Design a protein around this nucleic acid. Sequence first.
DNA 1: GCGATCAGCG
DNA 2: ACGCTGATCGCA
Length: 579
Amino acid sequence: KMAFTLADRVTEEMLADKAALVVEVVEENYHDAPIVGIAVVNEHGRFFLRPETALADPQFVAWLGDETKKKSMFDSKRAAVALKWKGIELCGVSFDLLLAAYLLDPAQGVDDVAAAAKMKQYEAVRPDEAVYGKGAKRAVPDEPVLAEHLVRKAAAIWELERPFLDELRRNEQDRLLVELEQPLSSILAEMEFAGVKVDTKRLEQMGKELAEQLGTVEQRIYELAGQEFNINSPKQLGVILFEKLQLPVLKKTKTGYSTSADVLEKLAPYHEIVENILHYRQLGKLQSTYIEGLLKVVRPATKKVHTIFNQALTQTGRLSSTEPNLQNIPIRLEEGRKIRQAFVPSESDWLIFAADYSQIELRVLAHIAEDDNLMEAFRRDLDIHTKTAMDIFQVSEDEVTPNMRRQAKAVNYGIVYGISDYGLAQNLNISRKEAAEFIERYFESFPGVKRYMENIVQEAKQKGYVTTLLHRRRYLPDITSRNFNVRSFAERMAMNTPIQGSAADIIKKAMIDLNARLKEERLQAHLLLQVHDELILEAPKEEMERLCRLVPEVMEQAVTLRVPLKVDYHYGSTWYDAK
DNA sequence: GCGATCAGCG
DNA sequence: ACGCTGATCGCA
Ligand SMILES: [Ca+2]
């Protein structure tokens, strides 16, 4: 039902200077994944190519790599990384429909062309699920069915760039798409393809040591509980704790007894099995997720893991990291922080460099709320987390333990993002009246932040959405809900999303300026990871000096706020030593 | 498949 | 009854 050429060879009319392009990687994880078909829609017609044909043709490769030949795509990063695994560069992507859809409404969860087309009442294209099937029935269909479905996706991309750019313009998001998200998409492709090298010997050794520490812990648990049970099964774990040992019930999930770590820490005075269980889970978490899980996804030839950065998933504009998640590698506990010793540079004589913004969401909040005292605090380069530990625990700066600090870190974010006195009290083991009066005092020092939280909720109510400093947008329909719980979660979304998503935009612009900087300095240094407010690079040791002077300035200068941005930086032989 | 849990980022 | 994630595991 759609006219197109099944091309046997590459012709000149498939090489126009503007085109919609589809490079299908059906595999979920597109690293080293097969390319199953290629479709080109342009002013001369609709063409389907087999990858063996086109990806071996010198003119087609030349056309993919030519930045002056513009391509419109859905999920250009997926295509670009699959082609990198094939020795082929893709440039000139001028429109990425996936990222256009994402800016317009991140809650749609657009994950194929058909879902984004629907936003503009375009339906001449099928959902990928309907073509490839789900689960274990997943299959590339036959060439005639595959070819039409790629051509329909391409035709759809072709027809929708203009209506999508039009809405982006009205929303003030067009420069956000073309100058921020699409450039960032090429950078993330380089980072994902480059990978991070992993010391598998060291990781293997930790795994053998974790196995023997686990049993030993697991044994004391069995002799304290009397019997044995699936310590991971809250069924009999509940029966052990809140029935056999008769410990108080402090929380009930919808399932039953809550055995979460906040509860267990509160039961620590009652019995010496709750601490062992906690130590057991920690050791379990390290062994399943970061020892075993990491070794599974290591590419054996190179000992590099290749994350996938989701750019169009989170509701606030942050990235997300998947298979493996390299954005929640342990750091706070010593046993788990040792895992970062396994993450090493990909080349002898190279080092890891890591820079990060100091309390960036609070600096943003100070800029957006225009709160005098909060702006002054950061113009003094105060550490508000330590200064809050001092007020909480009534000590001096020298006496602030890192524990008291991370606790005040949660009070600072918790208070500004709507924590209740109940919630503040559960986290400080103080009375609920003390927690309420601390929150009153805290908004005495920062009335401008209080005004800001009231106003942003009135602005959500009026407009239907909240925006970020760079005009990322998030619809909050529940902000006017009649249900008190549903309305309150939406109010705290209105207080949080403009801040957290403004910090995501800032580090996104920083990454873009960093790459351009590294290119004019022509350094071999390159990004490896982004962990929300931290940029981790690797580089030859000969380049660290330059990087110490370039990376902080580039980050601090990404945007200009009414308070300065602060950046800490370290380097070392491993990611461990880079903090 | 989903809820609980927990690792990280703020 | 602060917010944003992803992986693992058990299953009331
Ligand atoms: Ca930080």
